[PDB]
Design a protein around this ligand. Structure first.
Ligand code: CHL
Ligand code: CHL
Ligand code: CLA
Ligand code: CLA
Ligand code: CLA
Ligand code: CLA
Ligand code: CLA
Ligand code: CLA
Ligand SMILES: CC1=C[C@H](O)CC(C)(C)[C@H]1/C=C/C(C)=C/C=C/C(C)=C/C=C/C=C(C)/C=C/C=C(C)/C=C/C1=C(C)C[C@H](O)CC1(C)C
Ligand SMILES: CC1=C[C@H](O)CC(C)(C)[C@H]1/C=C/C(C)=C/C=C/C(C)=C/C=C/C=C(C)/C=C/C=C(C)/C=C/C1=C(C)C[C@H](O)CC1(C)C
Ligand SMILES: CC(=O)/C=C/C=C(C)/C=C/[C@H]1[C@H](C)CCCC1(C)C
Lengths: 194, 217, 39, 210, 165
């Protein structure tokens, strides 16, 4: 296990030690059954990968001056054209949903028909970064930890946006300009008595 | 043996070992609605649901009303909060009630199925892996898993006392809401305002002075 | 007194007392609430 | 039911108070400490409330006492209850959030050590730093006692701590009562009572406002 | 409004009927003195008439072409146009009292049925048991529904006498 989430507390007896990112954090005992634990493990890994891609995309698009992550589908609310890296795109919302739905359905169907494979490798690992199983477990710990941080970061993005209105990069600069005056307590909705 | 009436004949159905296992057993059943063990179990579930619902409602009425009296909040009266909240809203009351009925019907149907068969909600391959956590404890109406995240029900020594603080308080809340309705049809003001008006002059402002609760006087 | 109470517990005496009580209650209700046609 | 000092000489005190707890005088007419688990929780609650009220009474009395003398500083004429609407370097909301997070961390650490003694005596960052193995809930020791004052007569010192805590709790309740009735700072009420104690009493003050 | 009827508060025949009743009462009152018992009785009757007409018009009743009120028996129309107090609420009130009396009588019969001489308990009413059951019958719908769900409300076919067909 990677450690203990709560010092002094004993880890649950149903969490295997060889599991990547095992911190013994399960106060609700949701992964009590091994069948549910396997599905939740694959779901957590997939969630972390998608969260990493989403956080990286939001930060990149906001740091490149192409608007925040919230103003991304705004071109299809009032009528416009999407621009990727400043290059015009001739696809409308009606055609984008069709191609994305077809491609995602085919890829997800192929992935789910394997019986819940979490670490496929092979075609998805052309560089061979996991050729030996001795170091494969160490990188899995980094992967699940980065995914957990990415999920928390995306939750923070959505929460800070709904609480203030500014984007993640715009909120960071505002907090760095006025730390005591710009935080979660000065937004006005986190603490109603203040 | 604690009783709701010292000297009164406690019913035989309320003296069974199973009936005494329930929290807040004071031998109160003048109509004999708990003679049938199945009926007693169903009514025990109903009392628990009513206690929790009444506690949440009375809390949502009393706390914002007490904060409104001070400068903490500006929440309107409980009998007028519906209109004010639906005025500057995003949907009419009909659409909101429809979504509410759907979402409440799903969970109440699951709770009903678990009442009919305890632990039946843990059927494998039925809730995307979350069915295991949907099985409650040995006592009906006291589930674990997603509910009770702090895990305060694992210590048995306080468990028997914890339930006593849940039913009794709930019973009080059930009467509280009743008062909230009666006072609404007797004084025309809110509960906090009625409390303040009574504290101003208790010897002349009560239910025997409004002329509604005592028409013969 | 046991025989007197048993006689008062017969069907005609009980019927008389019960109907007198019910009739009196209905009469007093209509007296303090004259002409009730609706709720 | 022993030879320990009591709050009523000759009275039949309850048997669950055997003197193990500090400041045991057998005072419980409502029998709130009948349950051993409830009493175990109430001891920690009393100790925490006692130390907090001690810090409160000290922080209420010291600034007002220093303001009445030649000592001067920015917030001197402001009352203890009027310190909330003061111009600081940061808004009260930000400070409230910061203290809530810090108090959450330390209170969770204390709770963890309370449900299991010795389970939180290790510094999470530096493994070498730690607290002594012999420890009880509510009495941390170690770095919390850098001068080793607890190595002496711990029983008398614990009795002093609980007695001072009870006195401070009563004093803070009195501060609240005096602020709600008189509407003036506590030291002002103390000086008012010291000028003429026969006519400056709670009965006289409350009868005048009736 | 409903079925071509008009509210009693806006019906001319309703007001004419009230004026007719008050006119005949006043005409009968003119033959007596002012501080006599028949005059006070007639004035009380007139006040009762005024209060009755005012209360009927205040209740929102629907009057016809004859000036008399009409009742709405359809549950939809009653709950949609504010007429539930005519025939809906009294219907449920009678259902509660009817099932109340029926359940009290049924409980008394079943209780005295297992005794040595039930006929004596039928001609000579056992006042303590009857009073206890009368006070306990307030939960009659709950007890009846619980009895129906348990299957103990009805008797089996084999235990009931029938004709030789
Ligand atoms: C084909 C008919 C069919 C019907 C009538 C129902 C009915 C029901 N299913 Mg369902 N199911 C059906 C098919 C299927 N179910 C499931 C899987 C589940 C699950 C996993 C669960 C249910 C549950 C429920 C109940 C939810 C109650 C509710 O939400 O009420 C509120 C009403 C609505 C939300 C919509 C009402 C629309 C309309 C009828 C209203 C107008 C009148 C309910 C009695 C739940 C339950 O109670 O489990 C014990 C539950 O957990 N069903 C599968 C896949 C295996 C089905 C496949 O055909
Ligand atoms: C044990 C803690 C504590 C106590 C007893 C008080 C007591 C008081 N504070 Mg206070 N405060 C406390 C903590 C804190 N305050 C503030 C920030 C403020 C502000 C900004 C103000 C007060 C004020 C007040 C007064 C009126 C309270 C109020 O508005 O009630 C309403 C709420 C309820 C009735 C519930 C006063 C009685 C006010 C004042 O100065 O009044 C003269 C005021 O303006 N407090 C913070 C944030 C740093 C606190 C803790 O973190
Ligand atoms: C990867 C973890 C992470 C990081 C590095 C940040 C960082 C930041 N957050 Mg954030 N946040 C997070 C998670 C995180 N958050 C999560 C999980 C939530 C959901 C509860 C939030 C909800 C949130 C809100 C509502 C706000 C911020 C805000 C901010 C900025 C000011 C600090 C603050 O007051 O927030 C406190 C962080 C926590 C309480 C955690 C800051 C740059 C504020 C902002 O946008 O600045 C203008 C603000 O309004 N965050
Ligand atoms: C089941 C009980 C219950 C019910 C039916 C209501 C119903 C209502 N509340 Mg209330 N409330 C309750 C419990 C309840 N409350 C409790 C226990 C508290 C704490 C004491 C409050 C505190 C509260 C406040 C302060 C206010 C209301 C208000 C309202 C009204 C506006 C609807 C609304 O809030 O939007 C829907 C709310 C949501 C969909 C929740 C969104 C997420 C919230 C913002 C975060 C809370 C998360 C937390 C885990 C829960 C509405 C009539 C408002 C009002 O008066 O209207 C004018 C108002 O200001 N409530
Ligand atoms: C099945 C036929 C029938 C029906 C449906 C009615 C119905 C009614 N009659 Mg009527 N009546 C009938 C036959 C009938 N009567 C017969 C055969 C006669 C000749 C003897 C009379 C002579 C008669 C007279 C002289 C009067 C009535 C009156 C009334 C009204 C009184 C309501 C009331 O008592 O207040 C309410 C009753 C209660 C609140 C008691 C409730 C019971 C308990 C206490 C509570 C339980 C509720 C849950 C009512 C709508 C009175 C009226 O004013 O007409 C409008 C009136 O003066 N009736
Ligand atoms: C847990 C008890 C407690 C609490 C809640 C407070 C709370 C407060 N104190 Mg205080 N104080 C306390 C104990 C306490 N004190 C004690 C025991 C002493 C004696 C050493 C003092 C001596 C003291 C002084 C001299 C001052 C305060 C002041 C203040 C206010 C601003 C905080 C500050 O100065 O920034 C933090 C300070 C540093 C980080 C350094 C604040 C409301 C200020 C005030 O007067 O309010 C207007 C102020 O000048 N306190
Ligand atoms: C005892 C026999 C009985 C009879 C003969 C009627 C007869 C009638 N009912 Mg009805 N009803 C009854 C019992 C009865 N009801 C009971 C026991 C209930 C309680 C569940 C209802 C509750 C009820 C409602 C809620 C409504 C009616 C309505 C109606 C009227 C037209 C609808 C219809 O015929 O379909 C039979 C009625 C039903 C199957 C109940 C459901 C309502 C249907 C779906 C009609 C709703 C569509 C729409 C509103 C019709 C109006 C068209 C136009 C005038 C705008 C009609 C005169 C409707 C009406 O005229 O509103 C004032 C109305 O909305 N009833
Ligand atoms: C325990 C009393 C009792 C109960 C529960 C019933 C129940 C029933 N009767 Mg019945 N009945 C009773 C007494 C009772 N009856 C008496 C005393 C008589 C002689 C007058 C009748 C004569 C009778 C006939 C002719 C018919 C019924 C029918 C029916 C059925 C239809 C519902 C109905 O209301 O019909 C009507 C009810 C009556 C006409 C009489 C009601 C008399 C009172 C209200 C009942 C209680 C009186 C009793 C003195 C109180 C108990 C005292 C005790 C507490 C000390 C129903 C199951 C019908 C049927 O055949 O089934 C489908 C039917 O045709 N009954
Ligand atoms: C473990 C446990 C157990 C115990 O016992 C109990 C409890 C406590 C319950 C627990 C916990 C839990 C949790 C924490 C959870 C969470 C989760 C999450 C957050 C997720 C997310 C997750 C998240 C995610 C996926 C996300 C994703 C995202 C994305 C893709 C994005 C995208 C995008 C971008 C790029 C940008 C643009 O402009 C827009 C868009 C297009 C939109
Ligand atoms: C036991 C017995 C048996 C024997 O045998 C006989 C006898 C005697 C009869 C008996 C008795 C009985 C009783 C008393 C009962 C009662 C109950 C109740 C009261 C309930 C309530 C209950 C109640 C409840 C739930 C309540 C709930 C509430 C709520 C949700 C609220 C809500 C709200 C809010 C928040 C606010 C807003 O603004 C408004 C609203 C929307 C309004
Ligand atoms: C919205 C809708 O219509 C349903 C979508 C359901 C899916 C993709 C579930 C797919 C699988 C799962 C997890 C169970 C085994 C077989 C599948 C195809 C991998």
């Amino acid at each position: 296990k990677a450690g203990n989430w709560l010092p002094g507390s004993d880890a649950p007896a149903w969490l295997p030690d060889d599991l990547p990112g095992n911190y013994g954090f399960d106060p609700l005992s949701l992964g009590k059954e091994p069948a549910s634990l396997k599905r939740f493990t694959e779901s957590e890994v997939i969630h972390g990968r998608w969260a990493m891609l989403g956080v990286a995309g939001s930060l990149a698009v906001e740091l490149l001056g192409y608007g925040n992550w919230y103003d991304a589908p705004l071109w299809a609310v009032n009528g416009g054209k999407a621009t990727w890296f400043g290059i015009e795109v001739p696809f409308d919302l009606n055609a984008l949903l069709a191609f994305e739905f077809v491609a995602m359905a085919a890829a997800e169907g192929q992935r789910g028909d394997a019986g819940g494979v979490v670490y496929p490798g092979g075609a998805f690992d052309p560089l061979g970064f996991a050729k030996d199983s001795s170091k494969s477990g160490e990188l899995k710990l980094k992967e699940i930890k980065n995914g957990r941080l990415a999920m928390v970061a995306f939750l923070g993005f959505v929460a800070q946006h709904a609480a203030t209105g500014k984007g993640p990069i715009a909120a960071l600069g505002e907090h760095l300009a006025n730390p005591w005056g710009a935080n979660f307590a000065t937004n006005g909705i986190s603490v109603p008595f203040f | 043996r604690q009783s709701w009436l010292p000297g009164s004949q406690i019913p035989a159905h309320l003296d069974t070992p199973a009936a005494q296992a329930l929290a807040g057993n004071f031998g109160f059943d003048p109509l004999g609605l708990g003679k049938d063990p199945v009926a007693l179990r169903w009514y025990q579930q109903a009392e628990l649901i009513h206690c929790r619902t009444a506690m949440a409602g009375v809390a949502g009425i009393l706390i914002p009303g007490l904060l409104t009296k001070a400068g903490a909040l500006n929440v309107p009266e409980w009998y007028d909060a519906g209109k004010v909240a639906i005025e500057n809203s995003f949907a009419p009351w009909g659409s909101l009630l429809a979504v509410q009925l759907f979402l409440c019907g799903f969970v109440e149907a699951k709770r009903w199925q678990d009442i009919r068969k305890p632990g039946s909600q843990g059927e494998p391959g039925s809730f995307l892996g979350f069915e295991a956590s949907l099985k409650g404890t040995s006592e009906l109406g006291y589930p674990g898993g997603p509910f009770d995240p702090l895990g305060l029900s694992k210590e048995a020594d306080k468990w028997a006392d914890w339930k006593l603080k849940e039913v009794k308080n709930g019973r009080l809340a059930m009467l509280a809401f009743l008062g909230f309705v009666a006072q609404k049809y007797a004084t025309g003001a809110g509960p906090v305002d009625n409390l303040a008006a009574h504290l101003k002059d208790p010897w002349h402002v009560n239910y025997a002075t409004n002329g509604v609760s005592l028409p013969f006087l | 007194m046991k025989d007197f109470t048993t006689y008062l517990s017969t069907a005609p005496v009980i019927a008389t007392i019960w109907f007198t009580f019910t009739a009196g209650l209905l009469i007093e209700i209509n007296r303090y609430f004259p002409d009730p046609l609706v709720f | 039911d022993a030879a320990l000092p009591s709050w009523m000489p000759g009275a039949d005190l309850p048997g669950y108070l055997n003197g193990t707890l500090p400041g045991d005088f057998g005072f419980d007419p409502l029998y709130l400490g009948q349950d051993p688990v409830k009493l175990k929780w109430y001891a920690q609650a009393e100790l925490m409330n006692a130390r907090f009220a001690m810090l409160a009474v000290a922080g209420i009395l010291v600034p007002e006492l220093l303001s009445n003398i030649g000592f001067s500083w920015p917030g001197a004429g402001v009352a203890w209850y009027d310190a909330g609407k003061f111009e600081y370097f940061a808004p009260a909301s930000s400070l409230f959030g910061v203290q809530m997070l810090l108090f959450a961390w330390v209170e969770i650490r204390r709770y963890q050590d309370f449900v299991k003694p010795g389970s939180a005596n290790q510094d999470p960052i530096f493994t070498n730093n730690k607290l002594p193995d012999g420890n009880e809930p509510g009495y941390p020791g170690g770095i919390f006692d850098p001068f080793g004052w607890s190595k002496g007569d711990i029983k008398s010192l614990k009795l002093k701590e609980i007695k001072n805590g009870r006195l401070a709790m009563l004093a803070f309740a009195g501060f609240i009562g005096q602020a709600y009735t008189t509407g003036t700072t506590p030291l002002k009420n103390l000086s008012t009572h010291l000028a003429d104690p026969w006519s400056t009493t709670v009965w006289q003050n409350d009868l005048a406002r009736l | 409004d409903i079925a071509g009827l008009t509210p009693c508060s806006e019906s001319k025949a309703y007001a004419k009927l009230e004026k007719k009743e008050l006119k005949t009462l006043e005409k009968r009152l003119k033959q007596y003195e002012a501080d006599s018992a028949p005059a006070v009785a007639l004035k009380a009757t007139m006040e009762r008439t005024k209060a009755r007409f005012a209360n009927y018009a205040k209740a929102g009743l629907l009057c016809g072409n004859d000036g008399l009120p009409h009742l709405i028996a359809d549950p939809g129309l009653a709950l949609k146009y504010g007429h539930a107090g005519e025939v809906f609420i009294p219907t449920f009130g009678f259902l509660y009292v009817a099932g109340y009396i029926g359940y009290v009588g049924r409980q008394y019969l079943i209780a005295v049925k297992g005794e040595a001489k039930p006929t004596d308990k039928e001609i000579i009413i056992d006042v303590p048991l009857a009073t206890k059951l009368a006070w306990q019958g307030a939960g009659w719908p709950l007890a009846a529904v619980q009895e129906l769900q348990r299957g103990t409300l009805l008797e089996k076919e084999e235990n009931i006498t029938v004709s030789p067909r």
